[PDB]
Structure 1
Amino acid sequence: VDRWIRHAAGVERPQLLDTETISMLTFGSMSERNAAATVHGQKAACELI
């Protein structure tokens, strides 16, 4: 069901981050790369129920 969810949402798997990379990521990391091209600007939104 996790593979089905990752397919349905388009977001990829973590693909097994190492535990040192996990402590890196909870220390801080820039995971998301830049897009192909932006004409308006940097994206910004969030969500609340």
Structure 2
Amino acid sequence: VDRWIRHAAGVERPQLLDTETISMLTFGSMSERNAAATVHGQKAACELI
């Protein structure tokens, strides 16, 4: 069901990350790269229920 929800959400797998880079990612790391082009600027959103 995780594979199906990744297919339905557009975000791919967590690529079987290294067990030491989880400490990297909780220490702080930029992950999501840029897009190909931007004619507006940087994106911004959030959500509340």
**Both proteins in one fold, TM over 0.5:** yes
Pairwise TM-score range, normalised by the shorter structure = over 0.9
**Size of the alignment, in residue pairs?**
49
Q: 4+ runs of 1 displaced by more than 4 Å? A: none
Give the gaps of 5 or more residues in structure 1. none
Give how far 1:19 is off: 1.3
Alpha-carbon RMSD across the aligned residues, in angstroms, is 0.5
Instruction: Give the Cα–Cα distance (whole angstroms) in 1 for the partners of residues 41 and 15 of structure 2.
Output: 30
Normalising by the residue count of structure 1, what TM-score does the alignment of the two structures yield? 0.96
Give how far 1:46 is off: 0.4
Normalising by the residue count of structure 2, what TM-score does the alignment of the two structures yield? 0.96
More helix by share: 1
Give the gaps of 5 or more residues in structure 2. none
**CA displacement 1:10-44 (0-9 Å, x = unmatched):** 10110111111100000011110000100111000
Instruction: Give the Cα–Cα distance (whole angstroms) in 1 for the partners of residues 22 and 10 of structure 2.
Output: 22
Identity among equivalent positions (%) equals 100
